[PDB]
């Protein structure tokens, strides 16, 4: 019960092939969620190179709605994985607590779940055992997918375990006897999650288990009048028992109900002495390789937008002056152009001291404020 600098505590929940416990940092008190995978229960090959492949693969799936994995600690008896902790509990417990949800919150959870499944599909991994007991809520009422590929060990060995272990959440293809369960199981599970977020109950529920398999194989489900008919077309296009007509991520992204309230960050791509001191190379002014009659016009166009008051003495000597908004006094400086060579010209700044007035604020910091607004507009 001690990994890294984390002690363990009680048991958060149970999984299909994983025991989820709560870990606590002994100094900071931050809550982590460890996931135990017994090697005695399921282990294809016990070679340490596969553990190296886990360390290389599983950590790099960083997404703001996927639970990030921190490290995979090896053990002769088990495998520990330190996922992050969320204090809002499972989605199924939230549905059993609050019943039917509002449509504007169900779409907000559904977009985040679909953007967590689409990130996994872009990174070539599926979550075949997806259910409202495997998606969590945080404190900020978001949606978090618990295990992206950890369910795959259940699927890899035998499909019969997937049907027997999870009779409710199982695709018609899988119970019909298809070998490999692809992303159509992800779309079907996200449709069951959407029906749970819109109606509260489960669409395929029976007491007798072969009748439950027959109900999953049948493409009919209950529909109340509490939900609008604009989303029941999406549910019928998403919960097809035949995968040729089942919806894709693009077929949800072109639907009308999905595009109503959509945040832009869901989809990454729019198309489908003791201390060390490092020396710094400072410059003098602004090095512009243009014509000298145009640089003064560029400076004038820059300082005209900032509402300054300036006069000239030479054609390249400009004594500018601005009045501060909150501070009653005014600040003055002087720009001058220099010819270091025939190609480039340097714009050099010079300050002048206030002679008689005890001005408040600061002199040189307002001098740098007369320049930090000019460098940005000139951008040279």
């Amino acid at each position: 019960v001690k990994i890294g600098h984390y002690i363990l505590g009680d048991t958060l929940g149970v999984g299909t092939f994983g025991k989820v416990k709560v870990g606590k940092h002994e100094l900071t008190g931050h809550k982590v969620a460890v996931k135990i995978l017994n090697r005695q229960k399921i282990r294809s090959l016990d070679v340490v190179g596969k553990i190296r492949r886990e360390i290389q693969n599983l950590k790099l799936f960083r997404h703001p709605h996927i639970i990030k994995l921190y490290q995979v600690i090896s053990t002769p008896s088990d495998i520990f994985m330190v996922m992050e902790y969320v204090s809002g509990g499972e989605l199924f417990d939230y549905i059993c607590k609050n019943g039917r949800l509002d449509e504007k919150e169900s779409r907000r959870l559904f977009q985040q779940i679909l953007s967590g499944v689409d990130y996994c599909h872009r990174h070539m991994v599926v979550h075949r055992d997806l259910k409202p007991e495997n998606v969590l809520l945080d404190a900020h009422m978001n949606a978090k997918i618990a295990d992206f590929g950890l369910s795959n060990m259940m699927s890899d060995g035998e499909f019969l375990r997937t049907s027997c272990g999870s009779p409710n959440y199982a695709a018609p293809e899988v119970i019909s006897g298809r070998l490999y369960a692809g992303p159509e199981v992800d779309i079907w599970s996200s449709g069951v999650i959407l029906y749970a977020l819109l109606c509260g109950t489960l669409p395929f529920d029976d007491d007798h288990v072969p009748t439950l398999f027959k109900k999953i194989c049948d493409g009919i489900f209950y529909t109340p009048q509490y939900l609008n008919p604009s989303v029941i077309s999406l549910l019928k296009h998403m919960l097809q028992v035949d995968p040729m007509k089942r919806a894709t991520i693009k077929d949800i992204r072109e639907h009308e109900w999905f595009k109503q309230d959509l945040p832009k960050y869901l989809f990454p791509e729019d198309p489908s002495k003791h201390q060390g001191v490092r020396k710094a190379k400072w410059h003098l002014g602004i090095r512009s390789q243009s014509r000298p009659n145009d640089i003064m016009a560029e400076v004038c166009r820059a300082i005209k937008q900032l509402d300054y008051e300036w006069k000239v003495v030479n054609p390249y000597y400009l004594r500018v002056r601005r009045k501060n908004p909150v501070t009653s006094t005014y600040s003055k400086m002087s720009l001058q152009l220099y010819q270091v060579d025939s190609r480039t010209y340097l714009l050099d700044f010079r300050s002048i001291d206030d002679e008689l007035t005890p001005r408040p604020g600061s002199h040189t910091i307002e001098f740098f404020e007369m320049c930090a607004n000019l460098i940005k507009i000139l951008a040279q």
Partner: antibody
Amino acid sequence: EVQLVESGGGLVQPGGSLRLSCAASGFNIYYYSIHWVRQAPGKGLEWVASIYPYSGSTSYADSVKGRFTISADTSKNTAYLQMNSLRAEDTAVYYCARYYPYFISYYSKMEAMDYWGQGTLVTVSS
Amino acid sequence: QMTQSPSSLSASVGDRVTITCRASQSVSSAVAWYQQKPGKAPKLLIYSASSLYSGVPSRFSGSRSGTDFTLTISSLQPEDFATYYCQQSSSGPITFGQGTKVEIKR
């Protein structure tokens, strides 16, 4: 229940454009990349074309680069290999096959071709 | 962009054969093996050169040694007499092997 029925094959004149399809029945074409292969009589397999509809990225062999425009229609679950400017050497039986790019296991990025069609025989002769 | 080169052999029923596949460039563990009966469709045997595809039983086995992918057929049944194909898939273009045929000893 996956069957990949090819169509549009037969016999063509050299210098004529052909478009053979692959009716993907039993799965969805938008996720999996339909790959075409070439099986010359007596020789081995040879990969020719690829289209991946999920990211919208295609692939091509070096010998058929820029001459065989592959297309995929997600509404009818077909894959259109529109061949153009074919040579006399391109005379083979063309199998259709789906391609599984996903992690079936934690350690193995599966990258093989699971389900294969019967393949139609195109014959090019003057 | 690369090429493949298997061997060619022939053995008896129940013999343990092996087929190498020397990859040209440096590839990952993304090499498959396709059994094609004459006048049939190429059946998949082992997808990542080390783990068995579901379906066909455990007689077919594969090992990986750098860039020399192997296909070993222990206890050769009288139904497994067909042409076997190496297949590189890690890079952009896909290049098949030359294809080894397995003939019965006579």
